[PDB]
From Swiss-Prot, chains A, B:
Signal peptide as annotated in the record: none
Metabolic or biological pathway: Phenylpropanoid metabolism; trans-cinnamate biosynthesis; trans-cinnamate from L-phenylalanine: step 1/1
Oligomeric and partner information: Homotetramer.
Gene it is expressed from: PAL1
GO MF, any single term: amino acid binding
Keyword Membrane among record annotations: no
Name of protein: Phenylalanine ammonia-lyase 1
Taxonomic source organism: Petroselinum crispum
Similarity annotation: Belongs to the PAL/histidase family.
E.C. numbers: 4.3.1.24
Main location: cytoplasm
């Protein structure tokens, strides 16, 4: 028994976040959005909001028509009897004491005075057309429930505008949540002289042109009583935009979880930070899930198979992301309820033969969910900035080059240093955007609206935060792929150094007849030393390779006892010879190895090919043609970022992201 | 000609910030604050606000009495003729349409209904008594100008309350700027039954007890027409607190400038970042002054005399602090005007025989100056956090121990690591506090007060920020003194290592008969190496001293040519002997040197004794008894922080701070 509907809401929060995202993605890709008033999802809003030629269409449920007609007939019938009804024969808001019997004239006036927005020139003060399409879809879904008193034919007209991608121009600002912007949809439907629409290629259209292109026949609508109020008195603009925002935010949270694991891989972090006991003992489900996802990536990693504590951006990443995922998930359910709500006033209850006055236009679920989600996005951004900062810092990245520089000459390759500065600027602006909107409520409309939600303004700020998080995710992802390629370079160049030191050691020290403990210790120097600390000038006397090799020969000479006092068996007398032979040979050997790797024929294959995270690397590197960055070529990091950012904004990252987890059974690895 | 008073305001911003602070400090210490209505400074407010037994007294200018009596007589005379006057025979605010001829009864009612604050139990909802004293002083200064229509005897009564440290209890909250809190001063003067005061030792007093202790004779006042409005209708609580805040903020900005220079000293930064050409070419006077002050400290530094680029918290510190100083200075002039303004309504103009209605109670200068100053305080804090972070990090602090650890065993001394975490918590809360208050205005009082300044709320938040900045300054200052002592330890232990290496080198290598290029190169190793990288275990084979000493002997052996092939002149055959003699001798020599330094008899004196910054170190170390922190003793960093924080809060840091600059002539060093 669930009289206040807490139970059905709680049921919607079972199962994993990842399974919800997989469902959202499948829903988004369906060819038809069937609207009945109560099954709209944020992924259907996101799909319809697109203006990218996907071909998705909207169709209205015929099962809804009778209820819609009933309340429309009720309103018309109550005019014929000549009663007194708010928004039908009375004024609006604080001025509702005015009376009139010109019902159609009142609705015409309503749309006129709500057309109070400012467009100016250009598009800077215009609502994005995708958000207008989202608003149109959500408004239809509300009106289909049959409590609003509007003709079904008007909903059919809005549906044609959606399906033919003919979009009314709406002002960006003007709403405290959505009378003013929704009145520009009504104005297009009634052919107001200032009404404008945009066609699929951006052409500005008159209302007559828009009706013709959309396939609306019958001329402009003449609003019947209540129909203007039914069009404008709801939360569709704020909730439609919040839906688009949350669709991307849910995906980006999964991307942040997977990139935390790929980060761990290339950093050679200790995978035990994902151990399920740690997360089980905190009970938080977002943290448990985030750990299990990272553990899944790491359990199928060829880098972990190649393995005092890691720093917090690695080791506390499940604790950090967990509550953000929970907020984004909870916020999604709030918005999904809002886009299926009857946000209108008054409500026509034909069953009780009366209009019910209330406050369902008050968009508080939008403002709250968008403020909370914006703070969650800023936190995901801050972690990404901290991880990126560790990745490019040679003090912390366990042997990767400073700046992830790629070329032979570090003096002419500063790698990701510019990107790192950009990442700080993204993170800083994201922390600014994290401030709430909903604590700035003004007592409005002659103090009739003395609380108001500010939902659309908050959705807009969260939309801006998501865009910045995509800039950060793009830059981080390209950095991770650079690091992957640097680990491949590292393993191959280390193997070449080992082989060269071994061949020289044999040839020079095979006397004093074979110095064998010496050769193995020299090889241990190579195993121990960071390749990128010396490989740009491997035989330099001031770099660690030659210094530690000599130190090893000296250590063996001091332990060589009596044999060291005979020039024929002296290890010390071999040092100058060893160093000369190595200087003559190691440079060209390192160059040949690097050239071979650059030609696609490395001695050791790139281990990423055997990792579960390979689909993301493969997509960035092979599908998108993003290239390894190097000061030896003219290509800038931004040119590579463009490829990933544009693909990300087209949804092309979704498939390789989910592919990286597709064999996960949804449970953590056993701890018993 | 200066008809809008821009010119006289601009004149107040000439001369250096430091000279203004020196004047403020002298003003604060004067024994008598003489009030005439128009010469009050923030330093006089700060001095009077103190409840620390300084003995400062207030006295009222007799020259003010005639104007005060004139407007008080005017109000009484306009009652006798029976006219209509706002706040005298009419209601208040939005209810000013009500009429009455009971003039005294109206003022009694005014104080009753404004007594709408909440104290609860304890002091958490009570205005601090120092801020109440500031408010009382500022209100007298306003009323002395003679435009308010109040009896001079009431001002004399408030003066006795100040001079005898009898303070009415005021609620902390209740004002949008200061009717509600000021009505509790009026309530004490009229003996309201709920009125309470506090004596000098905290005893709660009835109004009768308070009058007796303060020396007010004549019984409770019975307010004459307008007198209640004259007491409560002004900005004295917000501006009084802003004055106290800005007094400390001005001093702390000079402290931040000087600590930036001491930071540069102990970091061995390049002093050229203070070069006047750099700052001259930006024109900003705060930056030019901040550079010249730091340059003055550094020009008299015995550490700079002992000397690719420094990091931003050092090298951009004048650029960073400059605009903060300008904001604090500009904000000070705004508040100094406000505390000398006639913030009251209506104004009695006996010259024109009329009351002038206006808005001078609108405390916008307070809200703006306190919001801007709070952001400036957060910026000074952020720089201090960044400097402290560099100071304790061995990657960045040019040879100081990680954490500024002080004991012989770093495994049992983590120095300032706890303080560093605390500094992040201080900085984080300061950045939170930097948000403004004045963008949260509500339309208030039946929408009569549809804009309001929120000045006191903003002053309170800036007061909290200043307190945190004092926590940060205390912790940083103790860290700087720790670093000073570590540089003293460093120079002495390095000298001992050099002498020991030299004596061993002589004794062991004086054969092959004296290895002289060898000895000088071994000494160059000691000169080059960071003492704190090895001095806890100086003869360890895995530490850099023994490694680089051996490397030097090996390098000389490889250059020794034919003599190296004879065991009698072999340098390589001396290594094991050299290392054994050094291991037998260097440990006890280092210990004797450290013990001698710990006993006050170092071989090399502490160079701080010859620096211009010595007064601050001497005060912290000798006057306050703050001690060098070491894991070898039980004393915690917090115990030492307490000494400095308490002294700082008593103003005891002012004298050594200004002493460090007292020979500065106020100009930068020539660049031509
Ligand atoms: N949200 C109000 C409708 C309205 C329309 C136009 C102007 C002002 C208000 P409600 O439904 O609460 O009357
Ligand atoms: N600031 C107003 C005085 C007032 C006193 C008590 C209640 C409400 C207002 P004003 O001087 O503008 O009338």
């Amino acid at each position: 028994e669930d009289p206040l509907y807490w139970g059905i809401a709680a049921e919607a929060m079972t199962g994993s976040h990842l399974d919800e995202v997989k469902k959202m993605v499948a829903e988004y890709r369906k060819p038809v959005v069937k609207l009945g008033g109560e099954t709209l999802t944020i992924s259907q809003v996101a799909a319809i909001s697109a203006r990218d030629g996907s071909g998705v269409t909207v169709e209205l449920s015929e099962a809804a028509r009778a209820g819609v007609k009933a309340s429309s007939d009720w309103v018309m019938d109550s005019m014929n009897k000549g009663t007194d009804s708010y928004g039908v024969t009375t004024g609006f808001g604080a001025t509702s004491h005015r009376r009139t019997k010109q019902g159609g004239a009142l609705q015409k006036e309503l749309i006129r005075f709500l057309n109070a927005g400012i467009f100016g020139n250009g598009s800077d003060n215009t609502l994005p057309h995708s958000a207008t399409r989202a608003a149109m879809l959500v408004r239809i879904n509300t009106l289909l429930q049959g409590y609003s008193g509007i003709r079904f034919e008007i909903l059919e007209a809005i549906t044609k505008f959606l399906n033919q991608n003919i979009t009314p121009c709406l002002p960006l600002r003007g709403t405290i949540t959505d009378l003013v912007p929704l009145s520009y949809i009504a104005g297009l439907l009634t052919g107001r002289p200032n009404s404008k629409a945009v066609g699929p290629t951006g052409v500005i259209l008159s209302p007559e042109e828009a009706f013709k292109l959309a396939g609306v026949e019958g001329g402009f609508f003449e609003l019947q009583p209540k129909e203007g109020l039914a069009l404008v008195n709801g939360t569709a603009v704020g909730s439609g935009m919040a839906s688009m925002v949350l669709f991307e935010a849910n995906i980006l949270a999964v991307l942040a979880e997977v990139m935390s694991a790929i980060f761990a891989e290339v950093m050679q972090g200790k995978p035990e930070f994902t151990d399920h006991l740690t997360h089980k003992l905190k009970h938080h489900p977002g943290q448990i899930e985030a750990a299990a996802i990272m553990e899944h990536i790491l359990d199928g990693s060829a880098y972990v198979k190649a393995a005092k504590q890691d720093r917090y951006a690695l080791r506390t990443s499940p604790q950090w992301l967990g509550p953000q995922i929970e907020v984004i998930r909870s916020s999604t359910k709030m918005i999904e309820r809002e886009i299926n709500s009857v946000n209108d006033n008054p409500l026509i209850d034909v069953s009780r033969n009366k209009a019910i006055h209330g406050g369902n236009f008050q968009g508080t679920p939008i403002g709250v969910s968008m403020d909370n989600t914006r703070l969650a996005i800023a936190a995901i951004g801050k972690l990404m900035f901290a991880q990126f900062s560790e990745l490019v810092n040679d003090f912390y990245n366990n042997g990767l080059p400073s700046n992830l520089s790629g070329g032979r000459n570090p003096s002419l390759d500063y790698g990701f240093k510019g990107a790192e500065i950009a990442m700080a600027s993204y993170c800083s602006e994201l922390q600014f955007l994290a401030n709430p909107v909903t604590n700035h409520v003004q007592s409005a409309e002659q103090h009739n609206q003395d609380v108001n939600s500010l939902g659309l303004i908050s959705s807009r700020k969260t939309s801006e935060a998501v865009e910045i998080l995509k800039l950060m995710s793009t830059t981080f992802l390209v950095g991770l792929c650079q690091a992957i390629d640097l680990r491949h370079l590292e393993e191959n160049l280390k193997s070449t150094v080992k082989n060269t030191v071994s061949s020289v050691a044999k040839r020079v020290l095979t006397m004093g007849h074979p110095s064998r403990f010496c050769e193995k210790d020299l090889l241990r120097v190579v195993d121990r030393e960071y390749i990128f600390a010396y490989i740009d000038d491997p035989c330099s006397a001031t770099y660690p390779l030659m210094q530690k090799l000599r130190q090893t020969l000296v250590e063996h000479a001091l332990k060589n006892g009596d044999n060291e006092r005979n020039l024929s068996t002296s290890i010390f007398q071999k040092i100058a010879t060893f160093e000369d032979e190595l200087k003559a040979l190691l440079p060209k050997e390192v160059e040949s190895a690097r050239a071979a790797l650059e030609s696609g024929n490395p001695a050791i294959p790139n281990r990423i090919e055997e990792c579960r995270s390979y689909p993301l690397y493969k997509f960035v590197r092979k599908e998108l043609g993003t290239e390894y960055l190097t000061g030896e070529k003219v290509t800038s990091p931004g040119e590579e970022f463009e490829k990933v950012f544009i693909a990300m904004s087209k949804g092309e990252i979704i498939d390789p992201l989910l592919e990286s987890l597709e064999s996960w059974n949804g449970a953590p690895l056993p701890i018993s």
